[PDB]
Amino acid sequence: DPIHDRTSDYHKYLKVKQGDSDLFKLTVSDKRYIWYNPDPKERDSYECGEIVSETSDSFTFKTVDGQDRQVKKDDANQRNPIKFDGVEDMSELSYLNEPAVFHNLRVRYNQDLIYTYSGLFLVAVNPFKIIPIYTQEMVDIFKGRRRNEVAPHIFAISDVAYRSMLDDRQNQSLLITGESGAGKTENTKKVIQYLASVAGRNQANGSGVLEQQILQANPILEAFGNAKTTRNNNSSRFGKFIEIQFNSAGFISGASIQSYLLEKSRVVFQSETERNYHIFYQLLAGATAEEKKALHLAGPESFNYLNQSGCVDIKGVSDSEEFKITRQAMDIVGFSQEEQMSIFKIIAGILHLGNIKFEKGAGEGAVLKDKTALNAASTVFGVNPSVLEKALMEPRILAGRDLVAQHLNVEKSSSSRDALVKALYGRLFLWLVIKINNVLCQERKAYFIGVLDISGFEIFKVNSFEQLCINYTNEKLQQFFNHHMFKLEQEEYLKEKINWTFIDFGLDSQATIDLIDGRQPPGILALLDEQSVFPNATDNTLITKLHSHFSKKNAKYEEPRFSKTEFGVTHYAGQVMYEIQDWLEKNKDPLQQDLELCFKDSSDNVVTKLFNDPNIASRAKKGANFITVAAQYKEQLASLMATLETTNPHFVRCIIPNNKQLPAKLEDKVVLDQLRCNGVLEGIRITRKGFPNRIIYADFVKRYYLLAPNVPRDAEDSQKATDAVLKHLNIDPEQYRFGITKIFFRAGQLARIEEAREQRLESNEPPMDFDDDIPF
Ligand SMILES: Oc1c(Cl)cc(Cl)cc1-c1[nH]c(Br)c(Br)c1Br
Ligand SMILES: [Mg+2]
CATH class of the missing domain: 1.20.58.530 (Methane Monooxygenase Hydroxylase; Chain G, domain 1)
Incomplete structure (x- = not known):
């Protein structure tokens, strides 16, 4: 069994590596240690010192140098016995304090153990390098195993949600928290992969395509919805709730993506060193020379929308290549070759719109002296260029009930053009999502596991x-x-x-x-x-x-x-x-209706849908006004x-190791900030001080049968029958607790003490079979 074979990739890549004879010497030491700050100013930089003496209320300890320092036992961060270093669930630590918890994460991290449990939830420290733990082999290992049986892993948290969906017939959710770049999206992908694999259909092998289409839905969105920020090279610029859908039986029956809050502004502006959406660079670098011809493409640096950040590529990413992945993902999902070319027309069209240069005319209103960009855009969009031009610079509005032609200045014309661009991009993105949703959802779900992948917390020099x-x-x-x-x-x-x-x-x-x-x-x-x-x-x-x-x-x-x-x-x-x-x-979020009028007329089947479809192009009316973005989003x-x-939530806390997107550099101040504000220690503390698992008195007749004074699934009294099977092994009384209608177990008694009763190899057929058909 791979999990018990120290040879396995499982053991090699998921288990704490075997300590040596020298480590054993230290592990059995009687010495005690304290975590202290050499510099009291830098409270997140810790050293380990040896406790050399103690009073009734104080420890005295040696600093990294030979100086002696004293501290109140009340204010001391004791170092856990080193046998605990690497421990897989930190609710097990004797001392639960910031440097202790960070240290454990550090030890696991130093050997590429990026997952660690913290009581009920999973912590995931971003490696910023590939680690071979997501193979179909790895999936297999985790299939069905109980959390305590296997090492900490995103697959394990996923399996548990799955088992719990089936055992409770209740909808679940994997909520993956993290600031930008912490790892939310990679872990989301693993959750889907795993669910896709563990609950997917073979059935003689010619229908599993649904599951491949689920998998493939994400590379598409990623190409239109992700971009390089200063914080992440693959930052999600939209949030998403993914419903993975199961039938009554427990198999995958479909999926549904709700997207949130696409960062439309990125399309027309990116701050220094950042990038527009991957799709623009993928297209430009991965199009056939004839596609480049039909779309009047050229290089990144030829477009105002791509050439202001000073960055057109991402280290170690091939846009030409990613483009192939996107196209293939679009094939597999079912985007017809016309649909795909329309999509790139729109992408190409946006780029040209961006090159339109407005200038001051004779008056204050703007003029378009060079119509190169305008025409290339209209060509590609299938719209009338002089209509578009008039809609850009001279949109008509009501003034009362009068119809008045505006003459926008350079500033207003540029803005309106941007607004058209963002509307184009945003509607396209929404369409892509709609198309995908319609392909994937073709079966009334019986249950779902919802996977939440939002844009993570972020701070820039300029926050808008x-x-x-x-x-x-x-x-x-x-x-x-x-x-x-x-x-x-x-x-x-x-x-x-x-x-x-x-x-x-x-x-x-x-x-x-x-x-x-x-x-x-x-x-x-x-x-x-x-x-x-x-x-x-x-x-x-x-x-x-x-x-x-x-x-x-x-x-x-x-x-x-x-x-x-x-x-x-x-x-x-x-x-x-x-x-x-x-x-x-x-x-x-205004758009001149003359622009909308101009595009509703597009000869393009995709562009027209973006502007004529009320579920895509229409806006909710909040009385006399359109609903604001603020109100709409508060509502979503x-x-x-x-x-x-309504779901049973499982939490994965992703944690960024540093702010440099580097592997093998765990910055303590960075990690601890996250550990504090996530409430990681408090979450461990509640799971230790409390009673997580509690079953109703009635149903308590569930795993408990005659492992005590004869009492099968029957009993006429509920609060009596309870204390029955427990007292047999005399399992600690203050280790559980009797409440009004339930029986609570302290830090999981169902597992801690219950290892002879349940999970046995005897106790079923062995303690019954001694005299089967041979008693004389
Ligand atoms: O309809 C829009 C308009 Cl008129 C202007 C702008 Cl800037 C954005 C959108 C938009 N963006 C996304 Br994402 C969706 Br869905 C929609 Br609708
Ligand atoms: Mg992301």
């Missing part, structure tokens, strides 16, 4: 509305963790009156959430909205308004003294300063979260 939305989302995901680990958990203990004294885990980012999406009193999004449909409002009246509501009034809010255009929100993962510029327009998010509350 997109970031506020991203970090608010991450803020809510974390509160969801807070809620299930601590709030719901204890509230239960209270209900069941199991004599639990409430603990405040000091983790609640509700105030921050409220500050953002609060209705009454109104939060940022509400004021943004109010201001968005106030006809005279500016970015400036907006920040003034925000300042007036929250400055020195909201503890999570800050009006900076160094700027008039920025406001600070204190998030769980840190304070973020947000630049107000353009918020109103971003929230209104609440819905997601409402769906999540």
Whole structure:
């Protein structure tokens, strides 16, 4: 058995490597150690010192040099006995403290053990290198194994969710948290791969295509939805909830992707060193010379949308090659060759739109002296160029009921062009998702495991509305963790009156959430909205308004003294300063109807669908106005979260090792920040101090049969029959607890002590068979 064979890749790649005779000498030492800060200023840089003496309330210890230092036992971070180094579940540590927990993660990390359990949930420290642990061989190992049986792995957390779906007939979710680049998306992929493989169909082998189409749906989105940021070379610029769908039997019956909050602005702007969406570079570098001809393509550096960041390629990525992967993913999903070429027309069209140069005419309004870019765009889109031109520079609006032709300046014309671009891109992306969803979902699900892959927390020199939305989302995901680990958990203990004294885990980012999406009193999004449909409002009246509501009034809010255009929100993962510029327009998300008119007329079957389909091109009307982006997204998010509350959540906490995207460099301050703000220690603490597993009194007749005074699945009393099978082995009384309608087990008694009763090789047929058919 590979898991027991020290030779296996399993053992080689997933297990702590065997310590040597020298390590054994140290492991049996009677010496004790403490984690301390050599520099009290740098509280996240720790050294190990030896405890040399102790008083009633103090330890004295040697620093890395020979100096002696004293500390209150109350304030001491004791080092766990080294036998614990590498331990797979940190709820097992004797001492649960920051340097201890970080140290354990460090030991596992140093030998490419990136997964470690922390009580109920999984921690995943990004390796930033490939590790051979996701082969079909690895899947196989994990198929069906109990969490305690196999090493920590994304596959194991996935299998558990799967088993729990089947055993409880309840929908599950894999919530994968992390700041940008921490590993959310790679782990999402593994979750799907694994589920796809473990619950996929062979059936004589000619129908498994559904599962290949599920797998293939993600490389498509990734090419249109991902881009290099300063924080991640493959940053997800949209969030996604993936439903993997199962039939009654337990097999995969389909999948459905809900996408969130595509970063439309990236298409027309990217900050230094960053990249537009992969698709633009893939196209340009991977098109046939004849496609380059039909689309009037040329190099990255020929396009304003691709040539401002100073970066057109990503180290170790071939765009020409990724392009082949995308095309193949589009084939496998079912995108017809016309559909695909339309898609690249739209991509090519966007690039040309970007090259349109507006200039000042005689008057104040703009003029288009060189129509090269305009014509190439219209050609590719199949729209009338002089109609598009007039729609760009001279859109018509109502003025009362009068029809008036605008003459936009250079600045307004450029912006409107950008708006057309972002609408184009955003609708295309939404279409791609719609197309995929329709291919994958062809069976009424019986159950699902939802996999959440959002854009992770991020901070840049300049943070705009997109970031506020991203970090608010991450803020809510974390509160969801807070809620299930601590709030719901204890509230239960209270209900069941199991004599639990409430603990405040000091983790609640509700105030921050409220500050953002609060209705009454109104939060940022509400004021943004109010201001968005106030006809005279500016970015400036907006920040003034925000300042007036929250400055020195909201503890999570800050009006900076160094700027008039920025406001600070204190998030769980840190304070973020947000630049107000353009918020109103971003929230209104306006597009001249003359542009829409111009494109509804496109001769292209895909472009026309982007503009004529009400489920793609239509906008919800919030009374007299269109629904704002803020309101719409608050609404999508609440819905997601409402769906999540109905599932049984499993948490994977991804952790970025550093900010350099380097393997083998675990930066303690970086990791500890995440460990703190994730509430990792608090999550371990609740699982240790508490009673995770609790079954109703009635159904307690479940794994427990005559392993004590004769008592089969029957009994007339419920609170009596309970204490029965337990006392036989005399299993510790304070190691469990009797509540109103349930029986709780401290830190998993079903596994800890229950290893003779259940999980045995005897106790079934061996203790019955001594005198079968031979008793005289
Ligand atoms: O309809 C839009 C318009 Cl008119 C302007 C802009 Cl900037 C974006 C979208 C958009 N983006 C995404 Br993603 C979806 Br779905 C939609 Br609709
Ligand atoms: Mg991602």
